[PDB]
Design a binder for this molecule. Sequence first.
Ligand SMILES: CCCCCCCC/C=C\CCCCCCCC(=O)O[C@H](COC(=O)CCCCCCC/C=C/CCCCCCCC)COP(=O)(O)OC[C@H](N)C(=O)O
Ligand SMILES: *[C@@H]1O[C@H](CO)[C@@H](O[C@@H]2O[C@H](CO)[C@@H](O[C@H]3O[C@H](CO)[C@@H](O)[C@H](O)[C@@H]3O)[C@H](O)[C@H]2NC(C)=O)[C@H](O)[C@H]1NC(C)=O
Ligand SMILES: *[C@@H]1O[C@H](CO)[C@@H](O)[C@H](O)[C@H]1NC(C)=O
Lengths: 815, 324
Amino acid sequence: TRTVFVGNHPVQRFCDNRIVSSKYTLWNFLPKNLFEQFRRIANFYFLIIFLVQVTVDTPTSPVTSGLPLFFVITVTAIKQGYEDWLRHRADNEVNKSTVYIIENAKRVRKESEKIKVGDVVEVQADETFPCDLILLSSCTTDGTCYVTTASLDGESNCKTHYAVRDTIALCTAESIDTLRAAIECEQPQPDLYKFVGRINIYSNSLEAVARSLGPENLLLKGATLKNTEKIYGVAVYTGMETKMALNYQGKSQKRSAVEKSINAFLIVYLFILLTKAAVCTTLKYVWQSTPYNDEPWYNQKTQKERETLKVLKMFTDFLSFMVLFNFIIPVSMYVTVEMQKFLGSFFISWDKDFYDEEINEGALVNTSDLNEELGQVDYVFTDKTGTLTEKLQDQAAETIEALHAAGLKVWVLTGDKMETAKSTCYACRLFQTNTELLELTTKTIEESERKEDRLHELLIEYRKKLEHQEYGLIIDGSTLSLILNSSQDSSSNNYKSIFLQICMKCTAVLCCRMAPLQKAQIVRMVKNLKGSPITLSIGDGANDVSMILESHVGIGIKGKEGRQAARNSDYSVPKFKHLKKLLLAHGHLYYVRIAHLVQYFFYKNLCFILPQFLYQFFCGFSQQPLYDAAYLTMYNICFTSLPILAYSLLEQHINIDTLTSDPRLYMKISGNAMLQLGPFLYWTFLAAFEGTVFFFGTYFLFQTASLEENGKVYGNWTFGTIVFTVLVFTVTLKLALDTRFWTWINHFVIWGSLAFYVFFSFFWGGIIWPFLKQQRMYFVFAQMLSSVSTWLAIILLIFISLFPEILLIVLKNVR
Amino acid sequence: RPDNTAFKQQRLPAWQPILTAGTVLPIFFIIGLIFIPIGIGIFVTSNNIREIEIDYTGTEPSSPCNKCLSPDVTPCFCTINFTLEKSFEGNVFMYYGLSNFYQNHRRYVKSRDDSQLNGDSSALLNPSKECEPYRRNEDKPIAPCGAIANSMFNDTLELFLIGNDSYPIPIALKKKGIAWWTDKNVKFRNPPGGDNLEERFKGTTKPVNWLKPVYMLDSDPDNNGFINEDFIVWMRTAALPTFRKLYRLIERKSDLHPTLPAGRYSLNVTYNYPVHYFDGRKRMILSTISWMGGKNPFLGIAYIAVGSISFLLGVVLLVINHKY
Ligand SMILES: CCCCCCCC/C=C\CCCCCCCC(=O)O[C@H](COC(=O)CCCCCCC/C=C/CCCCCCCC)COP(=O)(O)OC[C@H](N)C(=O)O
Ligand SMILES: *[C@@H]1O[C@H](CO)[C@@H](O[C@@H]2O[C@H](CO)[C@@H](O[C@H]3O[C@H](CO)[C@@H](O)[C@H](O)[C@@H]3O)[C@H](O)[C@H]2NC(C)=O)[C@H](O)[C@H]1NC(C)=O
Ligand SMILES: *[C@@H]1O[C@H](CO)[C@@H](O)[C@H](O)[C@H]1NC(C)=O
């Protein structure tokens, strides 16, 4: 509640029309982004290991460990910078707009950010209003102004507005000549059209004005002056303080369900890694408690080692086990996921089905981070006037039926009025003829007493039903405001909770007179309902930007209204019937590709490290790596990363055309099925079982004198390679069984990665080059390969390790 | 307008296999049909292999090496008798076995400089930081530095066959051929400079524990330094706390009689290796080698277990699908 003066001469803490929506400052983007990014437990763990690794012990070259960590941070830095750079450009586009105002009865030209409270602004025909303004003088008769409130409510029709009655006759002859008007106004509030004001216009002579400003007098920011000549507006509210702004709520970024499961899995293996390291250190000193176990006569410690504190040695020893098994958490998985979303997003753009020949424009992907998000959608929120209708789209009715058969509850939240909105819902097959409606509208709502009355009686009669296709709910803008805002009075039975109980078991929900911020609130309240159901918001208007940004994934249709919704939205499609192909076909495939991608990496590295952990028991607990230094490094780089990489890019779990044929298949992966506790726990035990077979299978093999006809014994580097050879062959062949869509690239990558391992081992092992201080792996692979017994054992261990997998696949066919 | 390439539209040709239950039913039988014959094939070979183990560590008053167990400043000797009820006909190999010798220890394994052992004259003078505290002795570097070379197993095991008379007959032993072909000829090389191995090692000294210099291993010049078969074999890591290394090789006799006839045998033990301090044990292994290798029943048993299970589950899977 402040006082606004038209003349500003009565007888940037507060934004004077300087609006900025950028999350990060261009000057301090790097320190802010890095500090927030390192806050994540996943990224902090990668950094801390790198600093420890160089400091105390390096099982592999530190260059290999830190570089992808430096890579993954840079890629995220580009993505956060690019998204921020768009916001500044959009803010610049709005700010750098020519606007004309009257200063000292002189017309001058300046930008939007210069306009301040109480200023008189001359708004010409067919130009958007810089800020919400009181209508004082119009040269047109009776001060009748028509505006199309396209941005405010997504509808484009003329809205009548009236100038102040004393100044309606004021033409373009110095209307504001040192005006002493003192407008007293309320605080800026997000009630859209609703407004109360107390105007006090006093000329040089004594005058008394008791006029009360109303919705018709005030013109809201963002509207388009249509079929109206030049008018004069006073900025009673300026800048952020508008009904067009402060409904954005800023941007809270987008978080996906799969990325939530990655962090949930990463913290589990971080605890296993702590357990693995802790048990080794505890068992190590118990084992070394014996006088001769530590420093026997053959190997003796140096003088530097002797002169160290026991507590200090324990700390570095614990970290030595930590850095040894740090391969449990795969850095390559974060790099691969980064690339999988980058290359995987282009498939949507290249799709011909997302091309509308009528407007000759195709779908695009603004945000590539939420490719997997489309496969988990179970709540859909549409626009209606723009998206659903145009009347109905070519396949608008068929699309709604497809979503319902796919287990997606679809909603038709619109800002359109009640009278015309109910007509469409019957036509679009959403509301069948037999469905009666629970019209919680202003016609059926009277003051506070009937508020709980309607809610409780629904709790009595409507709740008792759970037929299902008989009850449909209708809410209005005023009713929804009371339900959400004024629900805090009842603690025992909150009106929000009872409302959510109503909506959870309805065939459809149709809302009317919804302001853009209300669309965010209703979507937000659904989000906080017995967990976090995945919501999809689709809209094609400047008002829909609030709900599109509020939901998890936003789809922005590019229509006659404009491209305001498209640019902020994660994805854009030209027709509503394309929503079926988007989330059913692409959404299902995108999730299944990455869900199996995540589970494979964690399974892959557990088989990598578990034999290394078991080898500590047979070793002296001295953090002795079972594999060569080169083999440890290249396991994640070039050996096994490429097979799963090509799998994620192009793999159809079910035929892409078949997915659209039967929309029931989307229900299989609805509840994060592939990343649930069930499938995850099986993946870990399968990795643990394969790890045990790899080591102890070789351990019992090495119980003989020799494995060659020449009777030559084999070293520990032969023991490492035998385990590693089984490891690479099993893990890669495990992916082959999973893959059911074999392409030429998939054939080339899978079999090529196996052949590369054999080739590289021969190349690395067999040629001496004078730049390694150690030549442990000289001829081990060829000697390992040159034994008949080793060949038989390797084929055995591959089949035994794959026996639980092959048993499950055959069993899955029956019952 | 969008490019209609099958790759961009995700329409690439695919094999797209569909393996039903009936598709994989013959696979269970065929795997069982292969494993059982090959499994019993390798298992019967293991039993045909004849191997004997004789422990000469002592640790018992009845053991004749008890006097060698006690510390003797003079060299000690053992005479251990053992008898074989089964003769050896094929090639006979001799192994020395150490138990609870943690050769896998990280500090121990890295304690070697392969650049120095490769015959590089530069690295010979100054070994790297890996071999510590055996880098240098009395400010003189050790040519085979490191704990691995320092603690080389030095015991002489000789075998005497005794006939009808009390006179014993020594069995001929071959020093060469026990090491890997590539390690001897390529990995381990003598320094290039000079001809006499004396002149090559001027600045370097022998290892601390060694009583013989690195250039005085064997009389022959092709085993004198860095190329001795026993030295190379000991250099290779054990891969297990309990291990055995190829000590000697006994070729088949030129005469028609078996290589090692079944009879009473007497063993020399020179016992210069104090293994009892860390609860270690020493054993000597006589083995006959087949195509697969030494006597390993695990490989034969393992095929039988998987082979029988696969065939048994093949029948079980056959029955359950037969009901449909
Ligand atoms: C014969 C057929 C072919 C066989 C394979 C041949 C070799 C193929 C090569 C690589 C495999 C595939 C690729 C595998 C990638 C992952 C491998 C990996 O992460 O391996 C890592 C090292 O990788 C590199 O140093 C390569 C450069 C990585 C960054 C640049 C490369 C990626 C950049 C690409 C271009 C940019 C894309 C995004 C753009 C965004 C713009 C906004 C190592 O993983 P580790 O898990 O082992 O981490 C070290 C470990 N913690 C330790 O204890 O030491
Ligand atoms: C065979 O290898 C033996 C090592 O297993 C080694 O015996 C060592 O002989 C030297 C003779 O001086 C001694 O070495 C250590 O003994 C002194 C006195 O106790 C210590 O102060 C030093 O550490 C020194 O290095 C020992 O008698 C013995 N080494 C040990 C500690 O057992 C010889 O290389 C070989 N023995 C033969 C062939 O006689
Ligand atoms: C080896 O055994 C022979 C048997 O004749 C005997 O000289 C003595 O026990 C041992 N000799 C040496 C020096 O090892």
